[PDB]
Amino acid sequence: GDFLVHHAIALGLHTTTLILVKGALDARGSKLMPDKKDFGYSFPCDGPGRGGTCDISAYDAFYLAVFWMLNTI
Amino acid sequence: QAALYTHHQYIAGFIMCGAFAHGAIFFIRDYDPEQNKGNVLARMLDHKEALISHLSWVSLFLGFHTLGLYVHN
Amino acid sequence: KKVKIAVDRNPVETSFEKWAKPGHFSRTLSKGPNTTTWIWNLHADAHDFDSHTSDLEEISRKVFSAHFGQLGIIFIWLSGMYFHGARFSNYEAWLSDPTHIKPSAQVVWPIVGQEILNGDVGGGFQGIQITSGFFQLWRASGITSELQLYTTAIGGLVMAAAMFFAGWFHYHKAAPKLEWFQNVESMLNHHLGGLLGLGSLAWAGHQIHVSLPVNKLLDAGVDPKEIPLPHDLLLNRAIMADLYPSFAKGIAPFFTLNWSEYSDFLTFKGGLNPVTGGLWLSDTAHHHVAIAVLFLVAGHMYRTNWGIGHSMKEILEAHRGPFTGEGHVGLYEILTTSWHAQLAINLALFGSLSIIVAHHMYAMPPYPYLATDYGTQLSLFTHHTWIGGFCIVGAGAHAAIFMVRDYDPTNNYNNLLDRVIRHRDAIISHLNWVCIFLGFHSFGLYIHNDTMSALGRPQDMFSDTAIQLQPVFAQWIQNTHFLAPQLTAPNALAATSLTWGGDLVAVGGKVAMMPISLGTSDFMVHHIHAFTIHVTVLILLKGVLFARSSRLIPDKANLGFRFPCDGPGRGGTCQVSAWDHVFLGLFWMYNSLSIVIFHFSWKMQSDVWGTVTASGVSHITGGNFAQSANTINGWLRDFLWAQSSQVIQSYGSALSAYGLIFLGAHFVWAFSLMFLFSGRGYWQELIESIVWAHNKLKVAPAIQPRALSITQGRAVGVAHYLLGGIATTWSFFLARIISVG
Amino acid sequence: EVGPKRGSLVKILRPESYWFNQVGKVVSVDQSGVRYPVVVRFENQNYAGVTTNNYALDEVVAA
Amino acid sequence: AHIVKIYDTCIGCTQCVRACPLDVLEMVPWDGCKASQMASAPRTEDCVGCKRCETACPTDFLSVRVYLGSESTRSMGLSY
Amino acid sequence: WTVPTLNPDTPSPIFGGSTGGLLRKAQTEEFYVITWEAKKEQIFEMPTGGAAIMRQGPNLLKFGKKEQCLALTTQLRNKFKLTPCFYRVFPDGKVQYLHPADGVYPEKVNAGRVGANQNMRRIGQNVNPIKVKFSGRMMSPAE
Amino acid sequence: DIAGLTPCSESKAYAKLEKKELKTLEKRLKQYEADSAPAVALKATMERTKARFANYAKAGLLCGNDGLPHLIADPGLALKYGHAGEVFIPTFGFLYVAGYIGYVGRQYLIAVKGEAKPTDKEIIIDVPLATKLAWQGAGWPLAAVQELQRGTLLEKEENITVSPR
Amino acid sequence: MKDFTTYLSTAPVIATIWFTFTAGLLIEINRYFPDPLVFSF
Ligand code: CLA
Ligand code: CLA
Ligand code: CLA
Ligand code: CLA
Ligand code: CLA
Ligand code: CLA
Ligand SMILES: CC1=C(/C=C/C(C)=C/C=C/C(C)=C/C=C/C=C(C)/C=C/C=C(C)/C=C/C2=C(C)CCCC2(C)C)C(C)(C)CCC1
Ligand SMILES: CC1=C(C/C=C(\C)CCC[C@H](C)CCC[C@H](C)CCCC(C)C)C(=O)c2ccccc2C1=O
Ligand code: SF4
């Protein structure tokens, strides 16, 4: 049981830091939004164009990582 | 004991989410790619897709197999 | 003549070349995939026939043939149920002892240890205890054999083949023209007189000749093998006369208007059969005869090809007042030119009908040994309630689709639709206010009671003891229907239901139905129901009335019915679409019907269902709905936490699948929250960082991986939310009520 | 003349472009002294659904 | 107000101006060192921020960019 | 071409009234007037919700938002091929001609409108936010 | 004797669990007659149970205080004490099949990249090509190693990247 | 019937057939070799 729950803990840590690292490294731009640094840390979106850009900013990656952090802890 | 552990672990999770949040805020607001020409910090953004895809693989593997063993049991 | 058969001959070549070309129906999908969004759009647009073409004839033909496909599939499903009752059932054993044997019509293969689900249901049989009520329905029809179920299954497969042939025929060989579909007067005449009138008359005949005698002998203790077969009752009038003496007189009393002679098998007893706990099948037969006559006269109302009858256009264009301007002018064209309007109305009334069915089948159990099969009863109520809620949300959806696509302001000037769109602000403002008022004065009552009980002040609660909120109107209606056979329905022997009042009907020691007492908890939960319904209506009606335009976005109709947003501007216009109003009305319909079925389950297990051990009724939960349903903590403790002891302790039992699906539905529900709480922009960037790793190893697909559209993200989220929640409640309910009932 | 030929394969060196380091087929090069004369059609569309884009002589490289 | 900038990758397709529901953009001649026309944004005080313009821009990356700035009654699209 | 002055004696389409019309904003800060000349009496859709009949000849309409006026403009131009122009009206009585500011519609060129907010660089040529940091107000590198 | 784990052949909780499961099954069996369909089913289930317990105790599995077999993931402890068939052998057994699947799909992608519309060869599968590659993917480890040593498994810096690299 | 076999080669049909095959293979393996917790044969 400790094995399984420690691996769940590892999944939580790894996914939380995945979301956070991916919001930190894609923070200055991506392929979907290469000029993201010009829009700031927090900003709503870039519109429904280019397929849809809901939750595109690094702030949104943090906001998505807080759920996974709460689940990890 | 229970309260102290849960307290400090949730505090730690929030603080650790904020660490990466402010790392992203740094990359957007404070990071100069010209004054960090070729150092470890730029070398991070250089292979950021590798980092993110490998964190994706570890998260995916741990989730698949932890959930699968739990569901099997 | 104006009402005639009109078809095109061989309009569409029967060929497999368009099977091999996915997305043929669309000009935007016929170009082949470049992204996976194409793979999703091919399925989202498959049945949006009004977006394939724009002429109503081909749309209507596609709709007709797809309805034939749906009917063929329903027939396959029915034949499968009858076949599983004929082959994988304990039905012949259940007829001989229906009070002890659990109905089961699904056997599990012994492969990975799952033969534990083949439980000891009774009758020397091992299988899954079904909750569909098919055994009681078959006993009401007078089956008494597996051979009859097998032949009904074969007939159902034949009819499914017929339906699929008819779809192929009415699309590819002889497809009706548009003027044939627009014969709504004749369609209504035939669907009232023929579909419902002749159908109810034929079922009444079956009940006169097959169901009533077979069940009168079954209720007399006769073993099903000693019972005459239905054809022996059809041929030999002496047997029927021995059971019902009026058959000695023949059909002469019908033609001589001496109908009272038929009071042997056409009764108005009311109440329940004390042997089975179901409705009297003589009352049911008389019912079907009556409504058959009623629908047959109703189907002679509309004018088709002779001068008699009504033109629905005239009725509409004549119904207008000083408050409503032109009135119903232009609605005949709406409902003869737009399929989505018809679908809106029809889904609305079909879902309301399913919920009415749920409420009427538990209070007046129509089938024998259905009321004491508490699992069947609970499952049927829950099922039809859910189907109704879904149909109603779809009615909202398709009303919005009509408003966006098929609405034309030229045909609607100062009529009811124009005048509704013209004061939509008042409608929605008052609906918002009543939703807030109801939310407060319904849920804040529960919060007040929770706070008082936690504070140590039970004398300050809204309880049946401290501050009584008695539903006196419902109590008066109960008392009025209970006393109906005395004053206002004197030819009825008993009330329609025992829920109005009176004594209980106990079948096999268990309560079939007993008076339901309404108190403060019932007041509170009924106002909770009204609240949730009003909020669902708010969301869906706001999506309908603000589908074309708003004060935020005046050209919303050009963006379409199904669009994510207009942008992050105007502060943010996320979910301004009508599709998103359906998306939210789904959550609120779930939250409404969950409480509906929770109220039903707890009320039944506390105040109706139970055993008669001595002279005195011992209910399942003990009658705790009255004093514990005043608080949220009572619903959590005395209903959710208490009644979960059967679904979480089911491991190692035949109910272990219910615990497994409980956990898995929890999982699916929580998994929905990844799609609901998140947005497409994170997932596209993650997908491109993964596509990097695939490009590095030369396994980057040519169909470019995209994240799900915003609309598709929301759809996946709400689908997984509904599935998880509903399946969680499904497992909880069934594991609870198969054990305790 | 300037620019690759009207059927040549060309690799994109604009970083903000969806087809950065991706090979596209040249449609047209504007011989007028304009910014971004090279028209490159790609066999995979971008996030907006567009398959072609205009690129400068700096931002394109042979093969 | 919102900041609507237009960059020198504009091809003069006019679709951004066609798609703007607020008449913020227009087409001006020969300001871009380009073919005939280039897009302009002279009325960004009426821009709500819908980004319908840069949904309609075919260039990669966008030649029209909307940066959501300070909100007002016009930028928030208020009839009240 | 010169700026047309709004004629207030222009009639209005036949409309039975709604609840989506003007609010206190019209009384307080500003509202909008759109005028057009119709060749025949036609039923059109109001952006406020409802169907109105535009009169043969000139038609005046009041709205509380510019997006409403341009929605009706695009409807009249795309479904009826009319040529509407709308104004901004203040409770002061000041009228500001808005939509065809040059006389032609902005999707076509008129040779005499000056370009504004045109960055003469690529969108990937913007400076990093660390270069525009502490610019007074919070700014984007696009300026 | 690896981590305080006793063999399941010597553990008493293991035998207790066996007899408990068998008691459950025979208490279900008492309700039916001699040779009913349920009786046949339950006797087959009892035989499967006894066989499963015998085959887990025969396989040298280690049991805890609960009498449940515990697997040894560590190579070196699994190979020293004969527990390689628990996690170690099935590890490579799985990896063979997973690399099989991945290599076959990779070869299919690379083979259909050459066609004029590579996308319609992915929604509509080239079944003869797919079956050829599925059959010849049995040597996926050797082919993958030889494709790794030629530098042709990996793509060079022709993959696409975001503006800050 | 070139078009019919093109339809059967579509992603959903091929997926259905292949996963019916894989699931049937696993089910038959688990019928003839029941309860395989470890590799011991
Ligand atoms: C040493 C600690 C530290 C410091 C100095 C800062 C400082 C800053 N952060 Mg960072 N941050 C931290 C920790 C810290 N943060 C942690 C731990 C997290 C993770 C939780 C974050 C996550 C974070 C994000 C995601 C962002 C910042 C931002 C900011 C900046 C402005 C924030 C602001 O306006 O506050 C205003 C804050 C509030 C008004 C508080 C909001 C309410 C919170 C949720 C608490 C509510 C509690 C509630 C009342 C409890 C009710 C209980 C009751 C009912 C019983 C500032 C530079 C922002 C920034 O720089 O933008 C570019 C930004 O976007 N921070
Ligand atoms: C129970 C809820 C739940 C679950 C299961 C997941 C699952 C996942 N999340 Mg999280 N997430 C959740 C809630 C949840 N999330 C919530 C509430 C949020 C807030 C919005 C997020 C926000 C979030 C972010 C921001 C990220 C994730 C990521 C992930 C993935 C992590 C890798 C992993 O564990 O792979 C294992 C996979 C699973 C456990 C799910 C699959 C389940 C089984 C194994 C699949 C097969 C089932 C069955 C055969 C299907 C039948 C279909 C049909 C026949 C009916 C995974 C898909 C990360 C990601 O996607 O990158 C990898 C990531 O970056 N999630
Ligand atoms: C073999 C007989 C046959 C053939 C060759 C065709 C051929 C054609 N039909 Mg016709 N059709 C047939 C039988 C046939 N049809 C029947 C029996 C019906 C009655 C339902 C119809 C009704 C019909 C309509 C209404 C339409 C067509 C159309 C078409 C064209 C393309 C359809 C397509 O893409 O198919 C591939 C599609 C499928 C394979 C989907 C089949 C879905 C079935 C009916 C339901 C199965 C549901 C399933 C149980 C759900 C399971 C869920 C899962 C999770 C378990 C083509 C000319 C369309 C067209 O545009 O023609 C020009 C069109 O609009 N047909
Ligand atoms: C007495 C005549 C009659 C009857 C019984 C029906 C019955 C039905 N019609 Mg209606 N219809 C009629 C006349 C009739 N129609 C006329 C005159 C028109 C032209 C205006 C239409 C136009 C029409 C449309 C446009 C649609 C229907 C649909 C339906 C079906 C609705 C689903 C349902 O209730 O399932 C109940 C199911 C049953 C009771 C099963 C028995 C089905 C039997 C075999 C068919 C009924 C007899 C048939 C109408 C006469 C032709 C027989 C055939 C052998 C030639 C239902 C079967 C809908 C549908 O689902 O289409 C398939 C639909 O979309 N009908
Ligand atoms: C659709 C519903 C339905 C049907 C089918 C029947 C059918 C029947 N009822 Mg019932 N009945 C019904 C409703 C129905 N009833 C209702 C609603 C009531 C309440 C008022 C009753 C009350 C009732 C009583 C009280 C009695 C019956 C009786 C009968 C039987 C005598 C029929 C008769 O004399 O009428 C005459 C009918 C016909 C003349 C039609 C026959 C036409 C044939 C089929 C023509 C085919 C010829 C073909 C072209 C050529 C040959 C084909 C081939 C060989 C070449 C018959 C089995 C009597 C009986 O004996 O029951 C056992 C009886 O006593 N019924
Ligand atoms: C008589 C019933 C009826 C009919 C004929 C239609 C018909 C239509 N609807 Mg309506 N609708 C209905 C009921 C109905 N709907 C109900 C009850 C709801 C509420 C849920 C809706 C909500 C709704 C919305 C919100 C939309 C439509 C749309 C449409 C159109 C295209 C749908 C499509 O292509 O999906 C093809 C089929 C699918 C994509 C499959 C969906 C599968 C669902 C999501 C999963 C559930 C499966 C199962 C129960 C769960 C277990 C599965 C298991 C494997 C895990 C079509 C005109 C769309 C439209 O017109 O677009 C403009 C649209 O946007 N409908
Ligand atoms: C369950 C089911 C099934 C079966 C069913 C059935 C079997 C049905 C039947 C039905 C029927 C079997 C019907 C019948 C009908 C009949 C009728 C409907 C009749 C009528 C009559 C009338 C209406 C009359 C009139 C008159 C008179 C009264 C006298 C003289 C004159 C005249 C003629 C006018 C199947 C297999 C499908 C499967 C699914 C389910
Ligand atoms: C998780 C998630 C995703 C990512 C989900 C992905 C893109 C969909 C995955 C579906 C399946 C797994 C891919 C289908 C691939 C093949 C068809 C499967 C055949 C082979 C299998 C055996 C692997 C979004 O794109 C998204 C968008 C908007 C709001 C919320 C979300 C969201 O929550
Ligand atoms: S849907 Fe996307 S683009 Fe539209 S407002 Fe929401 S986040 Fe912004």
From Swiss-Prot, chain B:
The chain crosses the membrane at residues 2-28, 50-72. It is found in: Plastid, Chloroplast thylakoid membrane. The PsaA/B heterodimer binds the P700 chlorophyll special pair and subsequent electron acceptors. PSI consists of a core antenna complex that captures photons, and an electron transfer chain that converts photonic excitation into a charge separation. The eukaryotic PSI reaction center is composed of at least 11 subunits. PsaA and PsaB bind P700, the primary electron donor of photosystem I (PSI), as well as the electron acceptors A0, A1 and FX. PSI is a plastocyanin/cytochrome c6-ferredoxin oxidoreductase, converting photonic excitation into a charge separation, which transfers an electron from the donor P700 chlorophyll pair to the spectroscopically characterized acceptors A0, A1, FX, FA and FB in turn. Oxidized P700 is reduced on the lumenal side of the thylakoid membrane by plastocyanin or cytochrome c6. Both potential cofactor branches in PSI seem to be active; however, electron transfer seems to proceed preferentially down the path including the phylloquinone bound by PsaA. Belongs to the PsaA/PsaB family. This is Photosystem I P700 chlorophyll a apoprotein A2. The lineage of its organism: Eukaryota, Viridiplantae, Chlorophyta, core chlorophytes, Chlorophyceae.
Curated annotation (Swiss-Prot), chain D:
It is found in: Plastid, Chloroplast thylakoid membrane. It comes from the Eukaryota. This is Photosystem I reaction center subunit IV, chloroplastic. It comes from Chlamydomonas reinhardtii (Chlamydomonas smithii). GO terms for biological process: photosynthesis. Stabilizes the interaction between PsaC and the PSI core, assists the docking of the ferredoxin to PSI and interacts with ferredoxin-NADP oxidoreductase. The lineage of its organism: Eukaryota, Viridiplantae, Chlorophyta, core chlorophytes, Chlorophyceae. One of its GO terms (cellular component) is photosystem I reaction center. Its main location: plastid. Keywords: Chloroplast, Membrane, Photosynthesis, Photosystem I, Plastid, Thylakoid, Transit peptide. It is a peripheral membrane protein. Interacts with ALB3.1, which is essential for its insertion into thylakoid membrane. Belongs to the PsaE family. Coiled coil: none annotated.
UniProtKB/Swiss-Prot annotation, chain F:
It is found in: Plastid, Chloroplast thylakoid membrane. PsaD can form complexes with ferredoxin and ferredoxin-oxidoreductase in photosystem I (PS I) reaction center. PSAD may encode the ferredoxin-docking protein. It comes from Chlamydomonas reinhardtii (Chlamydomonas smithii). The chain holds residues 53 to 195 of 196 of the full protein. The gene is psaD. GO terms for biological process: photosynthesis. Keywords: Chloroplast, Membrane, Photosynthesis, Photosystem I, Plastid, Thylakoid, Transit peptide. This is Photosystem I reaction center subunit II, chloroplastic. Its main location: plastid. Belongs to the PsaD family. The keyword Iron-sulfur does not apply. It is a peripheral membrane protein.
From Swiss-Prot, chain G:
Transmembrane segments: none annotated. It comes from the Eukaryota. It is found in: Plastid, Chloroplast thylakoid lumen. The keyword Cell membrane does not apply. GO terms for cellular component: chloroplast thylakoid lumen; photosystem I reaction center. GO terms for biological process: photosynthesis. Its main location: plastid. Probably participates in efficiency of electron transfer from plastocyanin to P700 (or cytochrome c553 in algae and cyanobacteria). This plastocyanin-docking protein contributes to the specific association of plastocyanin to PSI. Belongs to the PsaF family. This is Photosystem I reaction center subunit III, chloroplastic. It comes from Chlamydomonas reinhardtii (Chlamydomonas smithii). The chain holds residues 63 to 227 of 227 of the full protein.
